[PDB]
Amino acid sequence: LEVAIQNAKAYLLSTSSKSGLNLYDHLSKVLTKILDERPADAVDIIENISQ
Amino acid sequence: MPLPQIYVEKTLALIKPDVVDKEEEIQDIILGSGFTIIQRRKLHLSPEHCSNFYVEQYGKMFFPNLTAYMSSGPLVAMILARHKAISYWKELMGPSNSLVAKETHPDSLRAIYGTDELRNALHGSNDFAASEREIRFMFPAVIIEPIPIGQAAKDYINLYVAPTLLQGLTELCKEKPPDPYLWLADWLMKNNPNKPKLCHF
Amino acid sequence: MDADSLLLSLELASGSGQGLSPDRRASLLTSLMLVKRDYRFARVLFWGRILGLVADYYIAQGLSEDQLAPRKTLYSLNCTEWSLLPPATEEMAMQISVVSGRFMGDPSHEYEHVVQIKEETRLVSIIDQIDKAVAIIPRGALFKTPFGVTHVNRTFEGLPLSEVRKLSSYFHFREADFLDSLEYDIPRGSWSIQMERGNALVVLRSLLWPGLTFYHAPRTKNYGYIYVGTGEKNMDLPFML
Amino acid sequence: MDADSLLLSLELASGSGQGLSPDRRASLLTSLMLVKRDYRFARVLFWGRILGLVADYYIAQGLSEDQLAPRKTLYSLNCTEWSLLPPATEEMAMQISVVSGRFMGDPSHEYEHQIKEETRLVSIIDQIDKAVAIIPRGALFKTPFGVTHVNRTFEGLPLSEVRKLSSYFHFREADFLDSLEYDIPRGSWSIQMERGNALVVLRSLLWPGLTFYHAPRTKNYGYIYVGTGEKNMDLPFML
């Protein structure tokens, strides 16, 4: 539903005081580093790009 | 289907055992046209595995020569995703009967890499349900869209799984063993409706 | 050829057979560490050696963090003392259109155009032509930021074995996907792709500027190139192709 | 060490100097290509050399998909005919403790202290692999499937934590492995560097003859043991 879409977007938009960034922009930057043409084995390195 | 979701359709590209040694050039063709490689499997198609894969065609049409042909060598299977993947794959692939397709569609894949009907260049899925069946049979546990949300999956469990689950949970109550995951797993591997009983020695 | 992996790169084993002595090798490790010290470079690659007629012209390039600027290249004669070359432009590189052949030794040799043409300016402009036309980059080594600053890919794997033989999996190391592909090449077929030691090495030997050698293995991290040759452009190439 | 480091001739550049020959470099390249062909190993490493009296032992090891699996080590004398060594048990480990003497060669040799030469080779191989095998920090990634894989985004070890000694693990069953700071006795590793900061040299002193190269900025690592084939218990007298 669209109400669940808005609730989950508000949940992803919530920031953390211990890091200063939220989950949405963190996953957006992770997807930015993913979507350049890496060979298709990024499943093991999706953590290491997040660090 | 709706606005905030998307439909990335899939199709199966089959590389016949006559043309598996020339795989890099046709791979250049299919990657350069726009089709993407999801996962490539190098599989030896057994004669007893080709019939269950081809219940749609071989189960009603008498053709054992192609069944012997799929076991004559290696077979490469790949999943493709593209905008209008079925239509563009049919346009690039062309129609069958490659003796006629050498004269009607000279830029097709079967005109160059094919010889005849039974010794075909490739094989492609026609319908979306046929594509889903082909992908579900050849490939491992991957997710094919649409996810059947709502009452579609509940009917699937309630007429495919949950009778057996009800008969399993009925005997699991009396008596009550500790750690009942052992009892449920042994009941499902033992009292299987789709798998026969096994007795090791 | 990177300065930190000069001994870790198969130079003589690349198949071109124009490599270095142990004297020149140890001189490059010490002297490229020196030009990494006094010239503030992010990383220094050994570009190659021009054979010349009476002496050898050892050429090395250094790069900043921007990774797409024109290179502050360096030259040496005895392969020990290196000094900066002047930056190149199109009007200065036009000046040697009336002369041809090999160039020898000291930079103070005057060439006849009569305007006296220095050896040094011909050398650095020829270095600019070999950098612009050939010495390709591999695919996946240069990823793109939204800004103009390009970083070298630390997560570069980056070439599968099915894409080794293809022309389109190599771009020109030149500011202009990211860069111009190798299928935009004149003439068609001006690169020799060659399989040495099986899948453990590939060479993209340039035929427009021989003997340029591009240095793989796949599954690596080298990602290198080297030009050792006579120095002039192969205008004879479409006849022999 | 892999065959890639056999191409660069990095055993001599580590500084141990017992080294390898282009004879044996080409022989290990072609024959370890054969070992990767016949036995379906994920990676095949030239383990090293055991010093002989009538013939020279050449040892290589193969690994499965799990990087901490028990390896199928192999031996060869003429550097082409690789043959599979049996796995080692503890019963063969305490059997060879009564034999003190140099490795001879000719693997059907018999010790009167019977005891076969191949059993001594296999137990010595398991002793060196359990003691002084070396894996740096972040080279191996513990997957949640239960197996160990090579970390392919392994950035090499920075120069600050090369000399701690808390940045090198063991290539066996236990940052999920046991470090080098708990080795008995302490200071039993020759901490060294090559020319510049281009390569880090670690030499075992509980077994004199293993050398570990490590380039601090690239993904280059591996251990080669070429040496006597003996565990010196004289090491506390040395330090």
Stretch (H or E) spanning C203: strand C201-206
Pairing of strands C43-50, C224-229: parallel
End-to-end CA distance of chain B: 53
Q: Are C125 and C93 in contact (CB under 8 A)?
A: yes
Listed residue (D68, D71, D70) closest to D147, CA to CA: D68
CA dist D109 and C106 (Å) reads 67
Model resolution, angstroms = 3.3
Partners of A45 on chain C (C-beta within 8 Å) are 155
For residue B117, the distance in angstroms to the closest alpha carbon of chain C comes to 29
Can the peptide bond before residue C221 be classed as cis, meaning omega within 30 degrees of 0? yes
DSSP state letter for D187: T
D48-67 burial code (b ≥16 CB/10 A, e <16): bbbbbeeebbbbbbbbbeeb
Reading the block at residue D160, the tokens are: 């600050």
Crossing angle of helices A2-12 and A23-34, in 10° steps, is 90
Task: Tell me, yes or no, if A45 comes closer than 8 A to chain D by beta carbon.
Answer: yes
Contact flag for C and B (3+ C-beta pairs < 8 Å): yes
Q: Is C7 on the interface with D (CB under 8 A)?
A: yes
Identity of residue A2: E
How far away is chain B from the Cα of C163, in angstroms, using its nearest Cα? 9
**Cβ–Cβ contacts within 10 Å for residue D133, how many?**
19
Chain D residue with CA closest to A47: the answer is D153
- CB-CB under 8 Å, C7 with D7: no
- CA-nearest of C155, C161, C146, C152 to C216 is C161
Q: What 3-state class would DSSP assign to C38?
A: helix
In whole angstroms, give the CA distance from residue C215 to residue C57: 21
Q: Tell me how far apart the alpha carbons of residues B86 and C100 are, in angstroms, rounded to a whole number.
A: 58
> Exposed, middle or buried: residue D213 (CB in 10 Å: 0-12, 13-18, 19+)?
buried
Is the CB of residue C2 less than 8 Å from the CB of residue C226? no
SS3 C120: helix
- Alpha-carbon separation of residue C116 from A25, B83, C75, C111, C205 (angstroms): 61, 62, 21, 5, 35
Q: Would you call A2 and B4 a contact, using CB atoms and an 8 Å cutoff?
A: yes
Q: Which residue has the tokens 């009007």?
A: C91
How many CB atoms sit inside 10 A of residue C98's CB? 11
8 A C-beta contact, residue C7 and residue D8: yes
**Cross-strand pairs, A15:** A22
> Which among D206, D135, D201 is positioned nearest to D172, based on CA atoms?
D135
Q: Give contacts of B28 with chain C, Cβ < 8 Å.
A: 166
Residues of chain A positioned with their CB less than 8 A from the CB of B37: 40
Task: Please give the Cα distance from B139 to D135 (Å, whole number).
Answer: 36
Q: Ramachandran region of residue B113, left (φ > 0), alpha (ψ -120 to 50) or beta?
A: alpha
Is residue B79 exposed (0-12), middle (13-18) or buried (19+ Cβ within 10 Å)? buried
Query: Which chain C residues are Cβ-neighbours of A29 within 8 angstroms?
Result: none
Tell me which chain C residues have a C-beta less than 8 angstroms from the C-beta of A39: 140, 157-158, 160
Amino acid of residue C71: R
Entry field: residues in chain D: 239
Q: Give the pair of three-digit tokens for residue D143.
A: 């997957």
C166 to B27: CB separation less than 8 angstroms, yes or no:
no
* Minimal CA separation from C170 to chain A, in Å: 13
* Neighbouring C-beta atoms of residue C208, cutoff 10 Å: 18
Helix (H, G, I), strand (E, B) or coil at D117: helix
CA–chain centroid gap for D181, Å, is 19
Tell me which chain C residue has its CA closest to the CA of residue B27: C162
- As a whole number of angstroms, the distance between CA C205 and CA C212 comes to 6
3-state secondary structure of D227: strand
- How many angstroms from the chain centroid is the CA of residue D229? 12
C215: enclosing H helix or E strand: strand C212-215
Contacts of C157 in chain A (CB under 8 A): 38-39
Tell me which residue of B68, B72, B92 sits closest to B82, measured CA to CA: B92
Type of residue numbered C1: M
d(CA D161, CA D157): 7
The residues that bridge with C227 in the sheet, in sequence order, are C48, C212
Positive/negative CA dihedral, B44, B46, B52, B55: positive
Contacts of B96 (CB under 8 A, 6+ apart): B110, B117, B120
Closest CA to B79 of B38, B137, B124, B43: B38
Name the helix (H) or strand (E) containing C72. strand C72-76
Torsion angles phi and psi, residue D43, rounded to 5: -140, 140
Burial zone of C8 (CB within 10 Å; 0-12 exposed, 13-18 middle, 19+ buried): buried
Cα–Cα distance measured from residue D118 to residue D104, given in angstroms and rounded to the nearest whole number: 11
- Chain B hits for A39, CB-CB cut-off 8 Å, are none
- Taking only residues 156 to 185 of chain C, the set having a beta carbon closer than 8 angstroms to any beta carbon of chain B reads 162, 165-166, 168
Using CA coordinates, name the residue in chain C closest to A37.
Answer: C140
Q: Pick the residue from chain D with its C-alpha nearest to A49.
A: D153
* Separation between Cα atoms, residue C4 and residue C29, nearest integer Å: 8
Alpha-carbon dihedral D136, D141, D147, D149, rounded to 10 degrees: -80
Checking DSSP bridges between strand D43-50 and strand D220-227, what pairing results, if any?
parallel
> How many CA atoms, within 13 angstroms, populate the side-chain half-sphere of residue B189?
7
How many B/C residue pairs have CB atoms within 8 Å?
5
What would the two tokens of residue C204 be? 């993209």
> DSSP string of chain B?
--SSS----EEEEEE-TTTGGGHHHHHHHHHHHT-EEEEEEEE---HHHHHHHTTTTTTTS--HHHHHHHTSS-EEEEEEE-TTHHHHHHHHH--S-HHHHHHH-TTSHHHHH--SSSS-SEEE--SHHHHHHHHHHHS-S---SSP-TTHHHHHHHHHHTHHHHHHHHHHHHSS--SSHHHHHHHHHHHS-SSS------
Q: Residue A5 and residue C57: Cα distance in Å, rounded?
A: 65
- Give φ, ψ of C206 to 5 degrees: -75, 135
Q: Any residues with CB less than 8 A from the CB of B70 and at least 6 apart, and which?
A: B16, B17, B45, B47, B50
Our answer on whether B and D touch (3+ beta-carbon pairs < 8 Å) is no
Please tell me which residue of chain C has the smallest CA distance to A39.
C158
Q: How far is D73 from chain C (nearest CA, A)?
A: 24
CB within 8 Å of D101: residues ≥ 6 apart:
D111, D113
User: Helix (H, G, I), strand (E, B), or coil: what is residue C61?
Assistant: strand
DSSP C100: -
* Closest listed residue to residue D3, CA positions, set D23, D29, D41: D29
CB contacts of B5 in chain A (<8 Å) are none
Give the residue among B120, B119, B94 at the shortest CA–CA distance from B108.
B94
Q: Nearest C-alpha of chain B: how many angstroms from A26?
A: 21
Q: Is C221 on the interface with D (CB under 8 A)?
A: yes
D22 touches chain C (CB under 8 A): no
Q: Under a CB-based contact definition with an 8 Å cutoff, are residues D143 and A47 in contact?
A: no
Structure tokens at A22: 């939220």
How far apart CA D169 and CA D151 sit, in angstroms, is 14
Structure-block tokens of residue B99: 């003796």
Which chains are within 8 Å of A by 3+ CB pairs? B, C, D
Q: Which residue of A has its CA nearest to D145?
A: A44
d(CA D93, CA B125): 60
Q: How far apart are CA D206 and CA D236, in angstroms?
A: 10
Best of C150, C152, C155, C170 to mutate (most A CBs within 10 Å, chain A): C155
CA separation (Å) from D182 to B43, C129, D142, D176, D209? Answer: 48, 58, 21, 14, 21
Nearest chain B residue (CA) to C167:
B28
H/E run at residue C45: strand C43-50
How do strand C142-143 and strand C151-152 relate by DSSP bridges?
antiparallel
Residue closest to D158 by CA, chosen among D201, D200, D212: D200
Which of D65, D140, D152 has the highest number of chain A CBs within 10 A, making it the mutation to test binding with A? D152
Q: B173 is written with which tokens? A: 């109550």
Three-state DSSP at C52 gives: coil
Which residue's entry shows tokens 């693990």? D169
Tokens representing B138? 């050849």
Question: CB distance from C37 to chain D under 8 Å?
Answer: no
The token pair at C238 is 């479409």
For residues D200 and D162, the answer to whether their CB atoms sit within 8 Å is yes
Residue D39 tokens, joined: 């036995």
CB within 8 Å: B37 and A40: yes
What would the two tokens of residue B144 be?
A: 């094919």
- How many alpha carbons lie under 13 Å from residue D200 in its C-beta half-sphere? 26
Q: Are the beta carbons of B4 and A40 separated by less than 8 Å?
A: no
B23 with B15: CB under 8 angstroms? yes
According to DSSP, the β-strands at D72-76 and D57-63 are antiparallel
Is beta strand C136-138 parallel, antiparallel or unpaired with respect to C170-172?
A: antiparallel
> Measuring CA to CA, which residue among C119, C115, C137, C139 is closest to residue C127?
C119
Cα gap D140→B154, rounded to integer Å: 43
Contacts of C65 (CB under 8 A, 6+ apart): C42, C149, C151
Q: Which residues of B are known to be catalytic?
A: 123
Angle made by CA atoms B31, B33, B37, in degrees to the nearest 5? 30
Residue B38 in tokens: 């999801």
Residues from chain B contacting residue C168 (CB–CB below 8 Å)? 32
Torsion B41-B42-B44-B50 (CA) sign: positive
Distance CA D45, CA D59 (A): 9
Closest CA of chain A from D220, distance in Å = 19
- Neighbours of C, requiring at least 3 CB pairs below 8 Å, are A, B, D
Chain C residue with the nearest C-alpha to that of D153: C155
* Cβ contact C13–D7 (<8 Å): yes
Does the distance separating the beta carbons of B4 and A5 come in below 8 Å?
A: yes
- Chains touching chain D at 3 or more Cβ pairs under 8 angstroms? A, C
Integer Cα distance of C141 and C151 in angstroms? 9
Q: How far, in Å, CA of D19 to CA of D209, rounded?
A: 10
Query: What are the E-state strand segments in C140-200?
Result: 142-143, 151-152, 170-172, 191-196
CB pairs < 8 Å spanning A and C: 14
Decide if A2 and B37 are in contact by the 8 Å CB cutoff. Answer: no
Separation of alpha carbons C185 and A23, rounded Å: 45
Whether D8 sits inside 8 A of C8 (CB atoms) is yes
Q: Burial, C235: exposed, middle or buried (Cβ in 10 Å; 0-12, 13-18, 19+)?
A: exposed
Q: Which residues pair with D72 in a beta bridge?
A: D62
Q: Which amino acid is at B36?
A: T
Query: Residues B165, B156: contact at Cβ < 8 Å?
Result: no
Cross-strand partners of D42: none
The C-alpha angle D16, D71, D219, rounded to 5 degrees, equals 50
Give, as one character, the DSSP assignment of residue D61. E
Contact C155 A38 (CB under 8 A): yes
CA angle C196, C198, C204 (to 5 degrees): 40
Q: Starting from the edge strand earliest in sequence, which strands make up the sheet with D220-227, in order?
A: D83-84, D72-76, D57-63, D43-50, D220-227, D210-215, D200-204, D189-193
Contact D185, D235 (CB under 8 A): yes
Partners of residue C143 in chain A, C-beta under 8 Å: 36
- Experimental technique of record: cryo-EM
